[PDB]
Structures are given as C-alpha cells and as structure tokens.
Amino acid sequence: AYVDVFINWFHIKALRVYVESVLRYGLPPHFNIKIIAVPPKNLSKCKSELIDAFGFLGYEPFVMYIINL
Amino acid sequence: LYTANDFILISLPQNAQPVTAPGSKTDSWFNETLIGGRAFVSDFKIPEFKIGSLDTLIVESEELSKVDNQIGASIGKIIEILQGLNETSTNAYR
Amino acid sequence: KILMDSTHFNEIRSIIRSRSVAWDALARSEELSEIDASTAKALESILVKKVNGKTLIPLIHLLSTSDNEDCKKSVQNLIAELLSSDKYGDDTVKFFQEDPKQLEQLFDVSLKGDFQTVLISGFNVVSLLVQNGLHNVKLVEKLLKNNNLINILQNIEQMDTCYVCIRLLQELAVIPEYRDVIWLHEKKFMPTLFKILQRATDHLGIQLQYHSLLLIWLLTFNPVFANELVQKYLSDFLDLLKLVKITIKEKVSRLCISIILQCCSTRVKQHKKVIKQLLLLGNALPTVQSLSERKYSDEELRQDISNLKEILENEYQELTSFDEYVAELDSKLLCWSPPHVDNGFWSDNIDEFKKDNYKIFRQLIELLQAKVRNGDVNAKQEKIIIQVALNDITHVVELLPESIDVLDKTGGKADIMELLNHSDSRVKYEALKATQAIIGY
Amino acid sequence: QAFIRKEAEEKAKEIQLKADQEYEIEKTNIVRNETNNID
Amino acid sequence: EKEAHEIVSKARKYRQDKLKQAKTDAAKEIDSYKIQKDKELKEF
C-alpha cells in the first residue's frame, strides 16, 4: 500500500496540476511542469524564491504545489 | 533516505520568464537565479488528456483537489501504520 | 511533371530557365545542327519563349550532341516547359515510347550540369517515365544508379533540390517497376528518408515531409518491402510514430498513420510480432490512445487512428508488466518506469528474475557495469538510467537474497560500491541505499 | 487561395493511389484462391 | 474563397469513385479467373 497509494496520490497530484495549468494559462496548457526537490534546510527560501518568480504570471497566480512526502 | 524530504511542483507557462530574473531560461530558473540549487529538480512529464468544458474543467479541478486531500490523509495514515511495525524497515516476509 | 507543382521545384525550374541560352547561338558555334537548333528555338518560343511536333527528335539529338552546360540547361528547360504545356509533351512522350534512345539520352542528361539544370533534366526524365509505354525497369535502375541524384536527394543543405528529388521519387513510386527499383535502392534511400523524417520531427519543409511520407507509404504498400523496412528501420518507425502525434498537419498525420498501419498490416511477415515489438519498445499504445482521444480533420486519418488503436489494444491485451520490464532491460534503457516503482511488479516477478541461472539479474548487473563505465559523462539521462538500475538491483537483492552471491561473483557489488563516488546526489543516495541493503541497516 | 484546392487534390490523389493498390491486392488474392480451385 | 472548398469536396468525391472502383477490379478478377479455368479446360 505504501507504494500503490503513493503512486495513486502522485497520479492525482499530476492530474490536479494539469487541471490548474489549463485553468490558469488556458488551452493548450503548454506549461513547463517541473518538480523541484529543495533541500530541507532551505525549503522556506526556495518557496520565497518561487513566489517571487511566479509574480510575472499575475495564492500565487502561477500553479504551485507543496508536497512533504 | 533520499536527496530531499520535500518536493515543489511548478506549472508555470513555458513562454513566461521568471519575474525575479526576467529573460532567464528554465535552466537559469532551476539554478540559483530562481531556486536554491536543487540537484534533483527535473520536469514532470504529465500525459495529455481530454480538456472538456470550462465549467467541467473547474468541477474536475475541485474534485481532483478533494481527492488529493483525501488520499494525502490516507497516505499519512498508511505511513503511520507502516512505521508502527518494526518489520517494515527490513527484508522480512519477502 | 507532377512534382513541378512544388514551390521548390518551381524555383528550380525558374533558375534553370534563367540560365537558358538561344539555340541559334549553339548553331552558330557549330554545337548543333542548324535545322535542329532552329526547331529547338521554335519549340522554346512556343512553350515559354509553333510547336515542333515530330521535330522534337532532332532537337533532342542536337541537345545530346551539345556538350555546353548552357545549351543543356536550355534544352532541359524547354523539355520541362513542353511537358508542362497542355499541347506540347504528348509528341515528346510518343517519340520516347517509340524511340527508347531519347529516353536513354534524357536519363543520361539527368543529374548533370548545374543543380537547376540537373533538377530540370531529372524532372523531364521522370515525366518521360510517367508514360506507361516509355516506362522501363532498366531506365529506372539507371536513374537510381545516378550518384549525383542520390547526393542531391541526400543534400540536407540543398533543401529545394532534396524536396524536388523526393517529390519526383514519390510521383514515380506509383509505377510497380519504379516500386521494385526503389526496393532495390532502399539500401541508400532509407537513410535519407530517415534523416528527413528526423529533421522534420525537430512551406518547403512541409512539402518535403509530405513527399517523404508519400514515398514511405508507397514503399510500405508491398508487404515484403514493408516487412523488410520495418526490421531495418525500427528506430525510424518509432520516430515516425512519435512525429505523427508531434506533427499538427492533417495530411502529414494521415500519411504517418497509414504508413504505420501498412507496417502493422497482417499481410506483412511476423505482423503480430512486429506490432507487439513496436508497442513495447516505442510505447505505441499510449500514443495511439492519445491520438484516438485527439481530433483530426480527415475521416481517413480518423479511421487509420482507430485501426491503430485497436491493433495496439489487441497487442497489449496479452502484454504483462514482466514483459515490459524484460523489454526495457533488453533496450538497455530505463526512466524509472512504474514497474520499477510499484512493489507489485517487483514482488510478482522477483521469482522470475532468478530464473535461468538468474539471467535477469546477470543482465541487470551487466547494464549497471556498462553504466558505471559510461557514467563519466554524468548526463541527466545517464544519471536517471543509473539510478533506475541501482533501484532495480537493490530490489532484486532485498527480495530473494540468493542472488547476492551471484552479484558479488559477477562484480556487481564492487561496481555498486565504486559508484558511490559519483557526484550526482541521486546517484549518491542510490549507492547509499544499495550499501544499506548489502550489509547495512 | 488556390493552394488549398491544389493541396486537397494532392491528398485525394494519394487516396486514389491507395485505393488502386488495395484493389490490385484484393484482385490478386481473389484470383489466387480461384486459380487454386481451378488448378 | 468558397471555390477551394467546392473543389475539395469534388476531389474527395473523386477518391470515393476510385475507392468504389475496387469492387470493379475484384469483379474483373473473377472474369480473369474464369479465363484461366477456360484455358485449363482447353488443356484438358
């Protein structure tokens, strides 16, 4: 289950990311869906930098998700 | 363990440059210009799917958010259950 | 010629006509007979500037005797104009059918002189070969043997010349004799078509891609030819399948779908095996599923997509996760596939991994050793492949630990230990996990 | 404007060419089965 | 403008007629097959 439920959760996360991208940037999405694994000691700084960078798309206007697993 | 204990998903449009560093590319964004220097940062190859109606898209997004919350709670419970048994961190029982 | 409708072909014809010279000057320079030169000049004036009619044979004879590059270009331009003219061309075609020597002279003039002149001469030769009476297997073989024509077709820089050659070959491919000639010359034709398809997958380019797709479909119309091409160009077939979804043109997508279906048609030898191999290695099933969900402007394209989706579903009906893992191991590539992530596959197929004296484990160890040898590049794809291989090895070691001794004997344990020096953080974590699975906790 | 019509004709030509190839194959298969019975 | 669309429909109709000609080729093959049977009967 720790593998199957995790895989299903990641599939749901990907589908939600695609839905958010098509809702925000329109159809087609053409969004650079990327996963960033920030080090634990700089999670807050990475989040702040991402928020600052997402301002050009104007919760932040850009589709952003936080996962701790 | 793994390289990092946290993951950040970004779905910014490809045609939009980062606000902090205008004119920067995806590599520059992944670098110190718009990141802290994450080694495992890579693109997620989400597959294509039917678009549907805009209202249908919004309903699907709400349902996906609810499902994500529920399955995150379920995964947390499963992780707690697995950590509650000492045999989880071994090769026992094949 | 039919291929002359292309913009590149029209530009080549215009360039050739710009270099044309009057036949009167050739007659004055004793390069041709006065009567033949006058007839050629009258024909040129009537066509593009009074048709010569039966006087085309002496004009062609004088052109063959005329060794001047300008005279040859003018003759080629006049022949092309006569072929394009509604009134002209029929007499020349009849003369070529009655006299094969004129066809031989036209073929000899093809792929000679300037690029525009060579293109015009080749177009004239193709138009002559378009007639059923003048068509000949020997003429097609001689045209295929032309090294200059092959170089022009394969010339990536000469986009116009390559497109014109591709269009001419596609137009000629309708003739079964020309189809057999193309089958014989496949050894040189296939790399050029594959390169063109790869460049397209990365206007004149659209027309060239359409001509290449039409030629591929014509070649795949025959079952033996399609079966031979599929085996020799499996990577090209996968690239074409990917470009079918990548391309947005309805005609190009329909042509690619038809080409894929012809290769997957039951008339081809080992059709089921070829279809299964394509669906496994090239991930054809998800692409066909996406195409079915997609929309196209051509009903024939929709029917071809439906047929391809049905074939892919039939192939994947008997597929299995263990089969996918075996195919990935055979391909010596890995990108963290769900079989390598879901514990179900790594648990059910664990027993099969140790089968045949742990053949799967030995193959994985060899792949890991090869990646370690090639790990100096530290490429992102290479790093991902190395991480996937390390995860697979760790899984196959933790489950059914009887293979630990085999891995140690084969040197896989030593390679895994040495891989801990890799600078990649993911590679370092994978090496630490492997070491923990070895003796650690 | 006329380019679209010309392009459509080229696509139809491929369809006609494909139909001709299919017709010859079907005719050969039908003839071969009948010839074997006659033989 | 609309002339190109009309020509496209006419071109598509031409392909359908050529597609319909496949049945004629099969019927012609049957007549060709009967010729071989007649030739074989002559040999007999």
Interface test with A, best of B2, B3, B5, B6 (most A CBs within 10 A): B6
Burial letters for C305-328: b for 16+ Cβ neighbours within 10 Å, e otherwise?
bebbbebbeebbeeeebeebbbbb
Interface test with C, best of D10, D29, D32 (most C CBs within 10 A): D10
Q: Is A49 helix (H, G, I), strand (E, B) or coil?
A: helix
Residue from the list B36, B57, B74 with its beta carbon closest to the beta carbon of A39: B36
Distances (CA, A) of E31 to C186, D21, D28, D35: 36, 19, 12, 12
- How many whole angstroms separate alpha carbon C358 and alpha carbon B83? 33
A19 Cβ contact list (under 8 Å, min separation 6)? B57, B60, B61, B64
User: Residue C329 — φ and ψ, nearest 5°?
Assistant: -65, -40
- How many whole angstroms separate alpha carbon C56 and alpha carbon C91? 8
Of A31, B49, A28, A21, nearest to C290 (Cα)?
Answer: B49
Beta strands in chain A (DSSP E): 34-36, 64-67
Burial letters for E8-33: b for 16+ Cβ neighbours within 10 Å, e otherwise?
beebbeebeebbeebeebeeebeeeb
**Beta carbons of B4 and C389 less than 8 angstroms apart:** no
- Look up residue C47 and give its amino acid: L
Contacts of residue B2 in chain C, CB cutoff 8 Å? 429
Burial letters for C343-364: b for 16+ Cβ neighbours within 10 Å, e otherwise?
eebbeebbeebbeeebebbbeb
Interface test with A, best of C290, C340, C343, C391 (most A CBs within 10 A): C343
**Beta carbons of C418 and C370 less than 8 angstroms apart:** no
Given an 8 Å threshold on Cβ–Cβ distance, is B4 in contact with A32? no
- How many whole angstroms separate alpha carbon C96 and alpha carbon C131? 9
Handedness of CA C370, C374, C376, C381 (dihedral sign): negative
D4 Cβ contact list (under 8 Å, min separation 6)? E4, E8
For residue A65, the chain B residue with the least C-alpha distance is B9
Greatest alpha-carbon pair distance for chain B in Å reads 55
Of D25, E26, D7, nearest to C266 (Cα)?
Answer: D25
Any CB–CB contact under 8 A between C242 and chain D? no
How many C-beta neighbours within 10 Å does residue C201 have?
14
Q: Taking the mean position of all CA atoms in its chain, how far away is CA C307?
A: 22
CA angle C28, C33, C35 (to 5 degrees): 100
Handedness of CA E17, E18, E19, E23 (dihedral sign): positive
**Beta carbons of B23 and B34 less than 8 angstroms apart:** no
How many C-beta neighbours within 10 Å does residue C135 have?
19
Given an 8 Å threshold on Cβ–Cβ distance, is A3 in contact with C342? yes
**Beta carbons of D39 and E33 less than 8 angstroms apart:** no
Any CB–CB contact under 8 A between A51 and chain B? no
**Beta carbons of C416 and C431 less than 8 angstroms apart:** yes
Handedness of CA C18, C20, C25, C29 (dihedral sign): positive
User: Residue C392 — φ and ψ, nearest 5°?
Assistant: -65, -40
Structure tokens at C309: 């989706």
Is beta strand B7-10 parallel, antiparallel or unpaired with respect to A64-67?
antiparallel
Structure tokens at C47: 């066509």
Q: Is C441 helix (H, G, I), strand (E, B) or coil?
A: coil
How many C-beta neighbours within 10 Å does residue E5 have?
12
Structure tokens at A63: 């589709």
Residue from the list B4, B17, B71 with its beta carbon closest to the beta carbon of A12: B71
Given an 8 Å threshold on Cβ–Cβ distance, is B60 in contact with A8? no
C166 Cβ contact list (under 8 Å, min separation 6)? C153, C196, C208, C211, C212, C215
Strand pairing partners for B10? A34, A64
Dihedral, CA atoms, C433, C434, C438, C441, nearest 10 degrees? 0
* Ramachandran region, residue C336 (left: φ > 0; alpha: ψ -120 to 50; beta: rest): left
Respond yes or no on whether the N-terminal peptide bond of residue A28 is cis (omega within 30° of 0): yes
What is the residue extent of each domain of chain C? 1-320, 332-441
How many C-beta neighbours within 10 Å does residue C49 have?
8
User: Residue B13 — φ and ψ, nearest 5°?
Assistant: -60, 145
Intra-chain end-to-end CA distance of chain E, in Å? 66
Subunits close to B (at least 3 CB pairs below 8 A): A, C
Q: Is C261 helix (H, G, I), strand (E, B) or coil?
A: helix
Q: What is the 3-state secondary structure (H, E, C) of C319-335?
A: CCHHHHHHHHHHHCCCC
How many C-beta neighbours within 10 Å does residue C88 have?
21
How many C-beta neighbours within 10 Å does residue C177 have?
17
